[PDB]
Structure 1
């Protein structure tokens, strides 16, 4: 994997082709809601009362430092291009007030429900929310084509740095030595040369050959002819003790926390659906190179994980099988998801996604929190989304430990059905940590 370098893309004004990820997203763009919440609009509670004029000036400084925020998109001769403008004020901005969490969440909903224009911009919105004494919040929506979950922490770190510099009368300008998203886009095209691309597409095409299962969860409603894009969320409420034993389980069995979550979720899906084979999508970060860690952009590729489950496997068996599947997938993680779909030529339907109908995410680092000025600031996500998937399981591990959230499609589910699912999943995860040797058929269902 070659290092990413600044200037790989022409610095002479010519528009770089959109990245593989961006191309996939632009082709989907209707005026639909954000497809998921975990990578969508976000806010941060600040322990001071931000000055609005200086905060707006700080935002302009972030636009100057983050070229993807100044990028719009257009087809030119059959190629989707990244057109970069010099307008550092291309942001949907407002100053508003809140006196309690309800009023703050109302401001969050207004930002979160914006439908930003990829051809004309802006591709970012920021609200400076002024709260009760010494409290304020920054609310932000960066279009999916221009961001990923980690971009939220990158944005806030850059914003707060700029706010502080401006306060001190210091300049806030682009770092010419940092690579751009345009540089990354060209680097990725060079990495996916014809041989390398064919090799990774060949891998998934073999792994995922034949008649793939379509997730068959019990639902409260049949899938409707007209999808309404109405996403819900519900906390998993995984006890802190079990969450800690689950992390210990992963460590002692020699798998990553993500591998163990994949395994537990696959057993949950297999039980609920009745299906032996289950497919789980996961958005894998492409920020391997430290040169990408301070950039806003779409540095993710969706991979498909296939698991087979039966009730004579042990907890340990399914952890080890998750380890093998995840290990092999991550080796081939640069093969763009939409090209995998194209190779597999799935039978696609309106409403249900290609290849995968559910996802599992583990939120880490800049997607969940930052430190600024020796203060830990949590990145909080809005709850509105378009329910691209039937269900998404979004996990995060903080100091109190690991916690989870279920993003779900309200076209299919009433909330008490999702609460029941979440109860069964957390129960399974607690059993995993207690009985790693047990055959799955000995892990009794909740309420037996």
Structure 2
């Protein structure tokens, strides 16, 4: 869970009085010692509500290690002859695509503007190195009677898909179209690479499209890192000089499967976490009374738009202060604000919000390529006329309770809860809230000037998806990915603007009742 990691970071920063606390920063190297160790332990106990001690800090002196310490066997490499293993999370992504026919909605884009036009032959060679390094990028998925079956292509058998595209109209719409193009994972590797050039394009835009089964947003940094390494090596006519991965995704999947156990085992983590979610999601609403422009259609088209709400740096910093002062993450502030927004729009006091949680505590997978996101239903209650500060306490309690049962795959949770189904409605929740941080130090890739560019998606996965997105070099914005079937664009622009308004009011005076 990344949430533990940012809480430990916020605690390190406050105690050491430093603004440079990263997930890999050693507490004692940061300037800490035994005296300040007591203050870190005391603050983490009051915030996290778990019995943490000096021992945990000593053995795990970095936020990533300490967070992982609070979250199960370590991932072990299974040897070269081991067959591929699809994780439960991958199986869930395969199910939603087959059962709900989401076409291209789950494709993950990663677009980088490059001041130089890249060499297509070197890029293709580098993509082959990237695919050879990360087995998940050359793992096909084929249907069967039992379900999906992984098929690991050998590096020499994985035909990479690398092509240059000349941009006619605006580049942003081309990026969205290329992203929406569906994969056939039975015959194509889950990676498409496109270099967009044109008279309007200065240099090129490098677009990586991954099928979600093979990458999450947390994979952007290792993707660009490794692709840059391979491109530079291939431009010099050599193979990239890198060590093997400490673990492949199949290693992570096998370890997760063995630890989860069988749902029929009363002592297995799977059944115990499923039992929690069965109780926690009792009497859940089928859906929230949101203000749509059109009724929910019989079948979902999964068309969508993207409405941005720019946040002034002073608002981003005020939101950070509000999170730090109440001992919550920025995500919890955003999640609380979204709950207030839907509440003020008439959704009631019982607000289920879907949210991704990253299962990247193990150091063998903490910085690797793959899909490590589970989906949790964060059920926030707004009854009793709470203030926003009160809500931040409720949200923290709901989230921490949820983060302790984050391994039960969301599809098993849907099976256990058994809500009424509808192919045009995502079950258990239809609004997702997430916090995302884009990679830093990706400005000099491929020996050029580079910058990430956001892709304006033409697809949507739920009714509403709110994302607080930090760019990695200072700024932040809210991205609302809305279902076009339900909302017009201007309704979504208004929705994302009213969320910023709620955030502005919460920072100004968190003691206002949310009603």
When normalised by structure 1's length, the TM-score is 0.90
Larger displacement relative to structure 2 (390-399 or 77-86): 77-86
Question: After the TM superposition, which residues 37-436 of structure 1 pair with which residues of structure 2 at under 5 Å, given as runs?
Answer: 40-75=108-143, 78=146, 80-88=148-156, 89-98=158-167, 102-130=169-197, 135-172=203-240, 175-194=243-262, 195-310=268-383, 312-366=385-439, 370=442, 372=444, 377-398=450-471, 399-436=473-510
Q: Structure 1 residues 372 and 329, CA, compared in 2 at 3 Å: closer, same or farther?
A: farther
Q: Structure 1 residues 307 and 386, CA, compared in 2 at 3 Å: closer, same or farther?
A: same
Secondary structure at the counterpart of residue 208 of structure 2 = strand
Secondary structure at the counterpart of residue 360 of structure 1 = strand
State how far apart, in whole Å, the 2-side matches of 1:177 and 1:224 are: 46
Q: What is the CA deviation profile of residues 338-383 of structure 1, one whole-angstrom value per residue up to 9, with x for unaligned ones?
A: 00111101111121111011101111254x8746569885443422
In the TM superposition, what is the alpha-carbon distance from 1:431 to its structure 2 partner?
A: 0.6
Higher relative contact order (CA 8 A, sep 6+): 1
Give the unaligned 5+ runs of structure 2: 1-71, 263-267
Alignment: residue pair count = 433
Decide whether the 8 Å contact of 2:436 with 2:468 is kept in 1: yes
Decide whether the 8 Å contact of 2:355 with 2:433 is kept in 1: yes
Q: CA RMSD in A?
A: 2.4
State how far apart, in whole Å, the 1-side matches of 2:280 and 2:76 are: 34
Secondary structure at the counterpart of residue 310 of structure 2 = coil
State how far apart, in whole Å, the 2-side matches of 1:197 and 1:364 are: 30
Larger displacement relative to structure 2 (406-415 or 77-86): 77-86
Secondary structure at the counterpart of residue 353 of structure 1 = coil
More strand by share: 1
Partner of 2:105: 35
Decide whether the 8 Å contact of 1:213 with 1:279 is kept in 2: no
Partner of 2:512: 438
Q: Structure 1 residues 265 and 160, CA, compared in 2 at 3 Å: closer, same or farther?
A: same
Decide whether the 8 Å contact of 1:65 with 1:175 is kept in 2: no
Secondary structure at the counterpart of residue 299 of structure 2 = coil
In the TM superposition, what is the alpha-carbon distance from 1:246 to its structure 2 partner?
A: 1.3
Give the unaligned 5+ runs of structure 1: 442-448
Larger displacement relative to structure 2 (19-28 or 313-322): 19-28
When normalised by structure 2's length, the TM-score is 0.78
